[PDB]
Short mmCIF file of C-alpha atoms and ligand atoms in Angstrom, two decimals:
data_model
loop_
_atom_site.label_atom_id
_atom_site.label_comp_id
_atom_site.label_asym_id
_atom_site.label_seq_id
_atom_site.Cartn_x
_atom_site.Cartn_y
_atom_site.Cartn_z
CA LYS A 1 112.69 108.70 120.52
CA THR A 2 110.78 105.23 119.58
CA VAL A 3 112.68 103.03 116.95
CA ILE A 4 111.23 99.64 115.71
CA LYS A 5 113.39 97.04 113.56
CA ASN A 6 112.58 93.92 111.16
CA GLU A 7 112.96 90.94 112.47
CA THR A 8 117.02 91.22 110.35
CA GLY A 9 117.71 94.75 111.66
CA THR A 10 117.95 95.58 107.71
CA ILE A 11 114.83 97.89 108.45
CA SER A 12 114.59 100.41 110.92
CA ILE A 13 111.55 103.63 111.71
CA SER A 14 112.49 106.08 114.23
CA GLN A 15 110.04 108.22 115.51
CA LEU A 16 109.80 112.18 114.67
CA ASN A 17 106.36 113.05 116.12
CA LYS A 18 103.12 112.07 116.54
CA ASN A 19 102.89 111.24 112.75
CA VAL A 20 106.32 111.68 111.44
CA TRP A 21 108.54 108.70 111.16
CA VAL A 22 112.05 108.11 109.54
CA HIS A 23 112.58 104.93 107.60
CA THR A 24 116.38 103.66 107.31
CA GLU A 25 117.01 100.90 105.19
CA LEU A 26 120.66 98.47 104.55
CA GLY A 27 121.57 97.68 101.13
CA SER A 28 124.60 96.20 100.38
CA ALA A 29 126.58 98.16 104.52
CA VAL A 30 124.62 101.29 103.16
CA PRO A 31 122.27 102.72 105.13
CA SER A 32 119.28 105.50 103.46
CA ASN A 33 117.31 107.71 105.34
CA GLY A 34 112.91 108.32 103.82
CA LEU A 35 110.32 109.53 105.72
CA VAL A 36 107.05 108.06 107.18
CA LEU A 37 103.57 110.16 107.13
CA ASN A 38 101.04 108.76 109.31
CA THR A 39 97.97 110.56 107.75
CA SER A 40 93.82 110.62 108.04
CA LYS A 41 93.72 108.68 104.78
CA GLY A 42 96.90 106.33 104.82
CA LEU A 43 100.58 106.13 104.90
CA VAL A 44 102.45 108.49 102.56
CA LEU A 45 106.55 107.55 102.11
CA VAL A 46 108.92 109.81 101.02
CA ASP A 47 111.76 107.64 99.34
CA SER A 48 111.15 103.68 98.91
CA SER A 49 114.49 101.75 99.45
CA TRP A 50 116.82 100.29 97.29
CA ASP A 51 115.46 97.19 95.65
CA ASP A 52 112.18 95.77 95.62
CA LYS A 53 112.77 92.83 98.47
CA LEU A 54 113.57 96.20 101.46
CA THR A 55 110.53 97.89 99.63
CA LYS A 56 108.09 94.74 100.19
CA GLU A 57 109.17 94.30 103.44
CA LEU A 58 109.60 98.82 104.75
CA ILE A 59 105.61 98.71 103.47
CA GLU A 60 104.82 95.29 105.47
CA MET A 61 106.14 96.43 108.22
CA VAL A 62 104.65 100.03 108.62
CA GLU A 63 101.10 99.42 107.57
CA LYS A 64 101.10 96.18 109.93
CA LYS A 65 102.29 99.03 112.52
CA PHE A 66 99.94 101.90 111.68
CA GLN A 67 97.17 99.93 110.25
CA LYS A 68 96.55 101.89 107.25
CA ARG A 69 97.43 101.41 103.96
CA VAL A 70 100.67 103.11 101.79
CA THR A 71 99.12 105.36 99.09
CA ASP A 72 101.58 107.53 97.84
CA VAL A 73 105.21 107.74 98.21
CA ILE A 74 107.86 110.47 97.15
CA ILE A 75 110.47 110.11 95.16
CA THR A 76 113.29 112.62 95.61
CA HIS A 77 115.95 111.48 92.45
CA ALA A 78 116.40 108.25 89.84
CA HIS A 79 119.37 106.31 92.30
CA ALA A 80 118.13 103.15 93.36
CA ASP A 81 118.46 104.18 97.53
CA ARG A 82 115.44 106.62 96.34
CA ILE A 83 113.97 104.98 93.50
CA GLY A 84 114.54 100.69 93.46
CA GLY A 85 111.32 99.92 95.19
CA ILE A 86 109.58 101.51 92.09
CA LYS A 87 108.10 98.06 90.53
CA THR A 88 106.91 97.12 94.00
CA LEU A 89 104.72 100.13 94.05
CA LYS A 90 103.38 100.74 90.62
CA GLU A 91 102.24 96.65 90.87
CA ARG A 92 100.66 97.86 94.21
CA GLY A 93 99.01 100.42 93.05
CA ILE A 94 101.05 103.38 94.84
CA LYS A 95 101.42 106.92 93.46
CA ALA A 96 104.32 107.51 92.82
CA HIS A 97 105.16 110.95 92.63
CA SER A 98 108.30 112.33 91.24
CA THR A 99 109.63 115.12 89.19
CA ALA A 100 109.70 114.92 84.86
CA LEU A 101 112.84 114.87 85.08
CA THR A 102 113.05 112.57 87.83
CA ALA A 103 110.94 110.90 85.60
CA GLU A 104 112.85 110.62 82.55
CA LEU A 105 115.86 110.36 84.00
CA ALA A 106 114.10 106.59 85.46
CA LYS A 107 113.19 105.80 82.37
CA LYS A 108 116.62 106.57 80.93
CA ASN A 109 117.57 103.81 83.68
CA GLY A 110 115.74 101.58 83.00
CA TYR A 111 113.62 101.65 86.12
CA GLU A 112 110.05 101.79 85.74
CA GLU A 113 108.78 105.36 85.57
CA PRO A 114 106.89 107.36 88.33
CA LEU A 115 104.23 110.05 87.33
CA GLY A 116 106.07 113.11 86.78
CA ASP A 117 103.67 115.30 88.30
CA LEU A 118 105.42 117.41 90.20
CA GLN A 119 106.63 120.98 89.16
CA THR A 120 109.14 123.02 90.95
CA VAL A 121 106.70 123.94 93.88
CA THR A 122 104.50 121.79 94.71
CA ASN A 123 101.87 121.51 97.33
CA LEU A 124 100.44 118.29 98.61
CA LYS A 125 97.70 117.90 101.03
CA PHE A 126 97.20 114.07 101.97
CA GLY A 127 94.23 114.15 104.81
CA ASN A 128 95.49 116.87 107.07
CA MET A 129 99.02 116.55 106.86
CA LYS A 130 100.39 119.69 104.61
CA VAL A 131 103.28 118.78 101.83
CA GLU A 132 105.43 120.73 99.81
CA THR A 133 107.48 119.73 97.23
CA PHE A 134 111.13 122.18 95.96
CA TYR A 135 112.89 121.37 93.34
CA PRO A 136 116.49 123.90 94.45
CA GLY A 137 118.40 123.50 91.43
CA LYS A 138 121.60 120.95 90.55
CA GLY A 139 123.34 119.50 93.24
CA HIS A 140 123.82 115.96 94.39
CA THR A 141 122.58 115.15 90.97
CA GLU A 142 120.51 117.45 88.25
CA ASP A 143 116.58 116.06 89.15
CA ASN A 144 117.49 116.21 93.40
CA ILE A 145 114.03 117.58 95.41
CA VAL A 146 113.51 118.38 98.93
CA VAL A 147 110.66 118.31 100.75
CA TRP A 148 109.03 120.43 103.66
CA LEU A 149 106.05 119.84 105.90
CA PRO A 150 105.53 123.34 106.71
CA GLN A 151 103.30 121.67 110.16
CA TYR A 152 106.41 120.82 111.63
CA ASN A 153 109.21 122.64 109.89
CA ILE A 154 110.68 119.54 108.78
CA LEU A 155 113.04 119.54 105.73
CA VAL A 156 113.80 116.24 103.97
CA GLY A 157 116.99 117.26 102.11
CA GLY A 158 118.21 114.25 100.72
CA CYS A 159 121.11 113.25 99.28
CA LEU A 160 121.32 116.70 98.13
CA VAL A 161 122.20 117.27 102.12
CA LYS A 162 125.53 115.37 103.78
CA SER A 163 124.37 114.52 107.21
CA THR A 164 127.23 115.50 109.40
CA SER A 165 129.42 111.80 109.12
CA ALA A 166 129.74 112.26 105.88
CA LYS A 167 133.07 114.26 105.12
CA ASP A 168 133.27 114.19 101.73
CA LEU A 169 130.53 114.22 98.93
CA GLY A 170 130.11 110.97 98.12
CA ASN A 171 130.00 109.74 94.46
CA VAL A 172 129.40 112.94 92.40
CA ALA A 173 129.71 111.04 88.96
CA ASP A 174 125.70 112.37 88.02
CA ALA A 175 126.44 115.90 90.28
CA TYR A 176 127.15 119.44 89.38
CA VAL A 177 129.59 120.46 92.13
CA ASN A 178 129.32 123.79 90.57
CA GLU A 179 125.51 124.21 91.01
CA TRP A 180 125.21 122.59 94.41
CA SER A 181 125.84 125.08 96.72
CA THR A 182 123.52 127.68 94.70
CA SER A 183 121.30 125.07 95.51
CA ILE A 184 121.80 125.01 98.63
CA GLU A 185 121.61 128.40 99.17
CA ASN A 186 117.98 128.02 97.45
CA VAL A 187 117.09 125.79 99.97
CA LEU A 188 118.40 127.99 103.19
CA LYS A 189 116.25 131.28 101.54
CA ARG A 190 112.82 128.83 101.03
CA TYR A 191 113.25 127.94 104.91
CA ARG A 192 114.62 130.50 106.79
CA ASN A 193 113.71 128.06 109.94
CA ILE A 194 114.39 125.03 109.80
CA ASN A 195 113.32 122.24 112.92
CA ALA A 196 114.89 119.34 111.73
CA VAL A 197 116.68 118.31 108.41
CA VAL A 198 116.36 114.38 107.11
CA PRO A 199 119.87 113.82 105.01
CA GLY A 200 119.40 110.96 102.66
CA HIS A 201 122.36 108.46 104.74
CA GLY A 202 122.93 109.36 108.04
CA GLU A 203 122.21 110.75 110.92
CA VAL A 204 119.31 113.28 111.82
CA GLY A 205 119.94 117.23 112.22
CA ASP A 206 119.47 120.64 111.77
CA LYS A 207 120.18 123.41 109.67
CA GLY A 208 124.05 122.91 110.32
CA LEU A 209 123.86 120.21 107.44
CA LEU A 210 123.29 122.06 105.00
CA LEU A 211 126.37 124.25 106.24
CA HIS A 212 128.23 121.30 106.23
CA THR A 213 126.95 120.43 102.55
CA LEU A 214 128.39 124.04 101.85
CA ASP A 215 131.93 123.05 103.28
CA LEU A 216 131.90 120.13 101.92
CA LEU A 217 131.40 121.93 98.02
CA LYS A 218 134.60 124.44 99.01
O1 C0W B 301 125.93 109.08 97.90
C1 C0W B 301 124.62 109.44 97.69
O2 C0W B 301 123.33 109.79 98.39
C2 C0W B 301 123.63 108.55 96.29
S1 C0W B 301 122.42 108.58 96.25
C3 C0W B 301 124.86 108.01 95.25
C4 C0W B 301 124.46 106.74 94.32
C5 C0W B 301 124.23 106.05 94.30
S2 C0W B 301 123.94 105.39 92.40
C6 C0W B 301 125.03 106.33 91.81
C7 C0W B 301 125.32 106.44 90.54
C8 C0W B 301 126.17 107.55 90.36
C9 C0W B 301 126.65 108.84 91.18
C10 C0W B 301 126.12 108.63 92.62
C11 C0W B 301 125.45 107.46 92.88
ZN1 ZN B 302 121.97 109.63 94.52
ZN1 ZN B 303 122.01 108.55 98.26
#
């Protein structure tokens, strides 16, 4: 698949299909993934990046390439890899969608607040692009949500879902290891036919990444 990088190599986008790309940024080294959705009404991101500098660079790269503005971002939980660029979003007039709990936790941790507009299931449409957000329960954090693209059967698992390269659950200080398996099971029950799964860190995979996360929780 096509992969495009910035002048420094700290930001990369990789095409999943005509209108869906994965963005990956390196924070001081630790890579993090989100999505870029190229819609008829603008670019929509799933997740920002580790900090304002990387978020600015990401936005500038995709706006130049796709020749449209970033209008919205979905924030999937309140840690820095997801929300670290919220100041940039708000000052540029980019809408930052989140659940109410993710917004409360952002404020509690001293970040600017996202909108708090997403419910347990929310269905959004941006141009012709359909996006569903789902809160499956506690796991990696208390507020983690997943994002589903029903027109492609692509699931953005975020940090709820570990990549194949992950050999342990990572930092579990904010995690609920006795609920995380049930939360993964709720994803598997809701989305019974999955084409690709994008983890918060590491390589894109399929439903097997959810099964891998279940095994790491044993
Ligand atoms: O492993 C991950 O996907 C992430 S986002 C870990 C993390 C980033 S700040 C932080 C603070 C407390 C516990 C975990 C973490
Ligand atoms: Zn996290
Ligand atoms: Zn993460």
